[PDB]
Design a binder for this molecule. Structure first.
Ligand SMILES: Cc1cc2nc3c(=O)[nH]c(=O)nc-3n(C[C@H](O)[C@H](O)[C@H](O)COP(=O)(O)O)c2cc1C
Ligand SMILES: Cc1cc2nc3c(=O)[nH]c(=O)nc-3n(C[C@H](O)[C@H](O)[C@H](O)COP(=O)(O)O)c2cc1C
Lengths: 104, 107
């Protein structure tokens, strides 16, 4: 099953919802991640060039897909196949971001 | 502000998350809507043709935008500018639906 993260659109995109699969994949309970930016999943061997593309996509509110090295709660590194899309109202305002983790 | 509704992909799309603006617009607290299909927002003056377009779009997992007459918890009618899109993973499976809605009653 694929993980899903919803964040607010502004003020550093705090997590507001995660699905069951997110907890299975990352080892984090919802209470541990709600209200935080998802970047806590990144660690010492995470590729800075990949993080830069995520940073610019979020700032522009455009969709992005990256393979990024993340770390489970227990500290084990895993490859996260991450796809992020902005959620917009019909006037073009960004309401939220949705992240999907296509990880086995 | 614009509301957001997140549903599961299957099993008649029960609501799993709503943002604060959803409650502002509809008068429903999260407790009152979680695990339910969003069609409780519809009522007798809702356009059945619009409902059919939503039904067919969701069944095919195709994005759709409609204006639909909905009802607040207290029964007050309002015009809902509704956009629904599937959320897919990188195998092409639908993992959720996301709805964004704006109260467009005011002229
Ligand atoms: C909805 C959403 C989900 C995200 N999921 C992840 C994730 O699973 N792993 C990850 O490393 N970063 C994820 N990010 C990216 C970080 O939150 C952050 O945007 C990025 O690391 C840029 O921040 P910087 O200023 O530290 O470079 C996600 C962002 C959003 C908006
Ligand atoms: C994510 C999501 C959000 C929805 N939001 C609304 C809404 O705000 N108002 C509404 O009338 N229907 C909404 N619907 C549609 C109903 O849940 C339902 O799909 C539609 O009424 C079809 O039922 P029928 O088969 O009897 O036509 C939403 C559906 C989804 C998947």
């Amino acid at each position: 099953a694929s993980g899903m993260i919803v964040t607010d659109a502004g003020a550093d995109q705090p997590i507001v919802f995660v699905n069951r699969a997110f907890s299975t994949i990352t080892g984090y309970a919802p209470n541990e991640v709600l209200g935080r930016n998802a970047r806590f999943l990144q660690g010492p061997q995470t590729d800075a060039a990949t993080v830069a593309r995520l940073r610019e996509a979020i700032a522009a509110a455009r969709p992005i897909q990256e393979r990024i090295l993340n770390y489970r709660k227990d500290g084990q590194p895993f490859w996260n196949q991450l796809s992020i899309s902005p959620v917009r109202d019909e006037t073009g305002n960004v309401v939220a971001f949705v992240g999907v983790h296509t990880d086995v």
